[PDB]
Amino acid sequence: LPGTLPLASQESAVVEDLLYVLVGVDGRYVSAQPLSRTFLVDPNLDLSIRELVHRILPVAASYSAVTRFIEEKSSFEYGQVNHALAAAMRTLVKEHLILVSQLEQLHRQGLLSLQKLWFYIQPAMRTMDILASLATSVDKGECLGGSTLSLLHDRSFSYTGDSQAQELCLYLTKAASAPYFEVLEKWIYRGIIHDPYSEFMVEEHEYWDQRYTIVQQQIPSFLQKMADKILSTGKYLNVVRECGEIIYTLKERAYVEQIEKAFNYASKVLLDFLM
């Protein structure tokens, strides 16, 4: 019953109630509604106060999307990329739970006004707005494997002037690509293709142009320049085997050059093997 409570004091009830909705647990007055989440505040609350509350509604709603997305992305079938994408997307959720703890401990001394809460959470309103946009654009068009590593390379190009959401989308793609770049160092420096889930750009079969064939969808779209030298590098390693490190960087092509240094040897062992 907030109608019987004064203005300057009832604010101390919303801030400690609103400090829980940002975690996922429901609240006392500002409740959540069943399922993109919609919220309900109060019939008898200051109209201006309700408008101010609405301003803090999106960060929570942008959090109830990433949390649901993280649990789902643990499926083994989703590929070895939609996995490490969900792990590196979890460390930020941990640091978002630390930022809500530091607020409640600062709320006990009463030093936390309603307006103060609105500012403090600004680094969180920008980050949990980036991840709630990838989590909703990776599931819209079903992506798994390379097509989930392309989206993290265009959504990192749009923020060319943010310099703050461009450090983030570089931290994800740097961690959501270690599994992919660990099956590649087996297909170039050797001939074996592990790829338990169907995600790699090169699949095999069972007279020699149908043995290994490029799959067009699962191309990282930043290796699209060398989609033919990769397939040609391992292929030469197998017609000899049955007879008898890479890291991702932006605006630096240390891996594009690293592939040419092995394909230029992959042929010199087979061509010499036939002469």
Binding site: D26, A87, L97, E104, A178
Partner: protein, 186 residues
């Protein structure tokens, strides 16, 4: 009901011992903002009960083999640590609150998840067929899980590589329980 009283019972529900009683730990007053976090906070205990029944039901019968022991005796080194965390959390109750627990117990909500779901994938497997199930779990990619299960495999696959290094250099296979893939005929 004070918030401190809830912090007193939750530190027990993390173990199996039950306001909070026993499949969800239905709590039974208090405000809605408290019941929700308790129900979503007392999930470690339910997971703990699941990872405890297996390492107690199969530590009873003597027909589980030699691999099924190094597995049932490697689910304990990953439980003493979960008993060290409960030690630390109890010393501070004398300050921590509900919203402070969520960050404390956000990581052991995952280890207590893989293990609680690693003992169901391998239920009736004994001998080497159990050391085969752990290998399937490795193909996950998640750098936190693939680094955990790839350690339990390094303990479960020690007895298997004990017969192998015996049946290769000495040719004397001995397993009253049929585990090794080399079956002899009397």
């Amino acid at each position: 009901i004070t918030e401190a009283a809830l912090v007193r019972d939750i530190l027990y529900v993390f173990q199996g011992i039950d306001n909070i009683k026993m499949n969800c730990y239905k709590v039974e007053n208090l405000s809605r903002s408290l019941r929700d976090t308790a129900v979503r906070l007392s999930e470690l205990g339910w997971l703990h009960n699941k990872i405890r029944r297996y390492t107690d039901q199969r530590s009873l019968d003597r027909s589980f083999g030699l691999v099924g022991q190094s597995f049932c005796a490697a689910l304990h080194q990953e439980l003493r640590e979960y008993y060290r965390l409960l030690s630390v959390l109890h010393s501070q109750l004398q300050s921590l609150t509900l919203r402070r627990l969520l960050v404390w117990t956000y990581d052991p909500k995952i280890r207590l998840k893989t293990l609680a779901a690693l003992v169901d994938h391998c239920q009736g497997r004994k001998g080497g067929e159990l050391a085969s199930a752990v290998h399937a779990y490795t193909k996950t990619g998640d750098p936190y899980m693939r680094s955990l299960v790839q350690h339990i495999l390094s303990l479960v696959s020690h007895p298997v590589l004990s017969f192998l290094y015996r049946w290769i250099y000495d040719g004397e296979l001995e397993d009253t329980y049929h585990e090794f893939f080399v079956a002899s005929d009397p």
